[PDB]
mmCIF file of C-alpha atoms (C1' of nucleotides) in Angstrom:
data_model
loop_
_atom_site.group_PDB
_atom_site.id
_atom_site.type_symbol
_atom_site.label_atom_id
_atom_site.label_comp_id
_atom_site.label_asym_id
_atom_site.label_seq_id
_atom_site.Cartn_x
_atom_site.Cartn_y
_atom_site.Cartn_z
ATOM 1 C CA UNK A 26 0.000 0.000 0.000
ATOM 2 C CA UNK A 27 1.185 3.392 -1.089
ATOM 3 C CA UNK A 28 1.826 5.700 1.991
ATOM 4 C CA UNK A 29 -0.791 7.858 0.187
ATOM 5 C CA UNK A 30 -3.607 5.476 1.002
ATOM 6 C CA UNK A 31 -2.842 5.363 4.608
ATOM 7 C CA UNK A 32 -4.948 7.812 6.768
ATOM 8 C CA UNK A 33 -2.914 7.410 9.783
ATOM 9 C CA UNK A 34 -1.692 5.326 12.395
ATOM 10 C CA UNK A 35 -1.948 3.962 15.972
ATOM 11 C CA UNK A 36 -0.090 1.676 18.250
ATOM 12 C CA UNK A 37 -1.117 -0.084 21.709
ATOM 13 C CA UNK A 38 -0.015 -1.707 24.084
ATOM 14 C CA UNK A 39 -1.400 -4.433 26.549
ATOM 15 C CA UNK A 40 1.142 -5.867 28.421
ATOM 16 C CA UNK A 41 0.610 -9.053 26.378
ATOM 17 C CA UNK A 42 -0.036 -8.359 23.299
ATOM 18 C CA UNK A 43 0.771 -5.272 21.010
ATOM 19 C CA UNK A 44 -1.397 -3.596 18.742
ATOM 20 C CA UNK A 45 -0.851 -1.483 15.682
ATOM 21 C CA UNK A 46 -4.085 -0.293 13.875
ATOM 22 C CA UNK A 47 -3.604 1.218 10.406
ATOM 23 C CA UNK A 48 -6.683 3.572 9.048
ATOM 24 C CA UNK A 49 -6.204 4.399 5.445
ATOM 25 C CA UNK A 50 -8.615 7.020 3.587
ATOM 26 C CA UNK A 51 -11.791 6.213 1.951
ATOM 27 C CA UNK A 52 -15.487 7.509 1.005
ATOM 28 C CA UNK A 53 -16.820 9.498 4.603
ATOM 29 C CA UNK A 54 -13.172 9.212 5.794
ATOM 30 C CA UNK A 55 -11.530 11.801 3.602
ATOM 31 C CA UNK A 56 -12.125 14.351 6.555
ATOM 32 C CA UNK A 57 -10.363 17.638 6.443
ATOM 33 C CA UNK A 58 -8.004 18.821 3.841
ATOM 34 C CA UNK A 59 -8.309 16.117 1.583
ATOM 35 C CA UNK A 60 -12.022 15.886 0.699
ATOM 36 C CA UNK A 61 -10.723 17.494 -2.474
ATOM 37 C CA UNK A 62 -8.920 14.261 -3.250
ATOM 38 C CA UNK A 63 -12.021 12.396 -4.567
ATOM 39 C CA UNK A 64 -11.899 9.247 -5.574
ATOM 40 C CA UNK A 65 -11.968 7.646 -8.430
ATOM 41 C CA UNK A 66 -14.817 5.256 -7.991
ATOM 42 C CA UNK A 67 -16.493 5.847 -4.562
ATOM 43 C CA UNK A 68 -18.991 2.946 -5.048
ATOM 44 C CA UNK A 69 -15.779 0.035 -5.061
ATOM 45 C CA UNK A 70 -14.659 -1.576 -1.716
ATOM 46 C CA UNK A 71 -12.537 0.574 0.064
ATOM 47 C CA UNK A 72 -10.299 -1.087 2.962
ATOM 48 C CA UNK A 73 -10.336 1.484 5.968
ATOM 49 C CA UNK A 74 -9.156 -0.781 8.887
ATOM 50 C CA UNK A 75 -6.494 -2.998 9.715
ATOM 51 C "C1'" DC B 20 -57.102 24.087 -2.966
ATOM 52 C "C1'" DT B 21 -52.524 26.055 -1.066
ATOM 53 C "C1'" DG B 22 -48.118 27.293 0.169
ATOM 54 C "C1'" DT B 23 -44.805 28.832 3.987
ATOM 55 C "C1'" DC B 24 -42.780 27.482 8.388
ATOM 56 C "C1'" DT B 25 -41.095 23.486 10.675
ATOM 57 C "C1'" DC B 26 -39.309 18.697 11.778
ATOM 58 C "C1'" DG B 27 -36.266 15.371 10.163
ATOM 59 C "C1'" DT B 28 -32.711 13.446 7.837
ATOM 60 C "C1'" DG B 29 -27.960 13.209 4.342
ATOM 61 C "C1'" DC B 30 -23.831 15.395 3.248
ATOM 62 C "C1'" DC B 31 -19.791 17.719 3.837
ATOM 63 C "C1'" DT B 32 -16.706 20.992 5.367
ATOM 64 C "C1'" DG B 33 -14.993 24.238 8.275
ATOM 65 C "C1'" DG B 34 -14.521 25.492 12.445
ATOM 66 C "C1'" DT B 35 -13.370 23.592 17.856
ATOM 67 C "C1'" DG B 36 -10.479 21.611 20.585
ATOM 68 C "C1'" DT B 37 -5.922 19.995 21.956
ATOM 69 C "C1'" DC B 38 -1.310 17.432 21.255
ATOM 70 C "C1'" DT B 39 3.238 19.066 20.287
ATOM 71 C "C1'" DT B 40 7.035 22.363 20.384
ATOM 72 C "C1'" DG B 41 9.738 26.422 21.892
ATOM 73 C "C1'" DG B 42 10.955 30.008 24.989
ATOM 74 C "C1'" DG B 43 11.076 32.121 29.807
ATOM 75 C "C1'" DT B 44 11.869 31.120 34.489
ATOM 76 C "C1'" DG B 45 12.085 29.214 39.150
ATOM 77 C "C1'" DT B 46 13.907 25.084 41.627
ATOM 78 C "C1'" DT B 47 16.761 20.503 42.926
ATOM 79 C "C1'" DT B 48 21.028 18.218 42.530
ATOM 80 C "C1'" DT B 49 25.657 17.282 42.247
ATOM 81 C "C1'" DC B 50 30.248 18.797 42.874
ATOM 82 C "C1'" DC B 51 33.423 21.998 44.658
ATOM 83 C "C1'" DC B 52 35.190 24.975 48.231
ATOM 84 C "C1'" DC B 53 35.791 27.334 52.944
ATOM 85 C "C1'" DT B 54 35.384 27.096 57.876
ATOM 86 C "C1'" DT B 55 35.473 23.762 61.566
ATOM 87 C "C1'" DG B 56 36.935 20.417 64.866
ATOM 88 C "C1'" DG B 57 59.656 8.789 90.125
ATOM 89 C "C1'" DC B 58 63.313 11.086 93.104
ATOM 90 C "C1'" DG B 59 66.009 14.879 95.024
ATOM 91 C "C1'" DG B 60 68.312 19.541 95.811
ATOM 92 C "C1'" DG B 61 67.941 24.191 95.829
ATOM 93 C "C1'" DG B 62 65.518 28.931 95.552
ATOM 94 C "C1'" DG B 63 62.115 32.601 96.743
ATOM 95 C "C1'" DT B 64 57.455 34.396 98.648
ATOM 96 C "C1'" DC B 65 54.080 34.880 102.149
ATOM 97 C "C1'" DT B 66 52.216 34.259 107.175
ATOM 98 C "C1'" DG B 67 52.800 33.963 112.241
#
DNA sequence: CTGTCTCGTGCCTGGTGTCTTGGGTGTTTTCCCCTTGGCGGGGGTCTG
């Protein structure tokens, strides 16, 4: 994935286990300075979590 | 009939709030430094 697609980034951790979310952009998502970056095809599947 | 104000969504975007950073400024924290901690023979002098 293209650092473009990724949103942002978060990282927790639980003693156990460590966990690193990554939120990329998509339709609803493209808060802020970037709802001018529309996308190409809104209606696909766009991956926002993992 | 009738249409203008209102409730109730979608949509989105722009405006709210706050991490993050830098400067000013007082305060502790170490190291360094200064002050401190047996025997005898004489002599003379004073009191009675």
């Amino acid at each position: 994935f293209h650092i473009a697609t990724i949103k942002n980034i978060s990282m927790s951790v639980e003693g156990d286990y460590t966990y690193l979310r990554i939120n990329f952009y998509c339709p609803g998502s493209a808060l802020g300075r970037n709802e001018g970056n529309i996308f190409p095809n809104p209606e696909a599947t766009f991956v926002k979590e993992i």
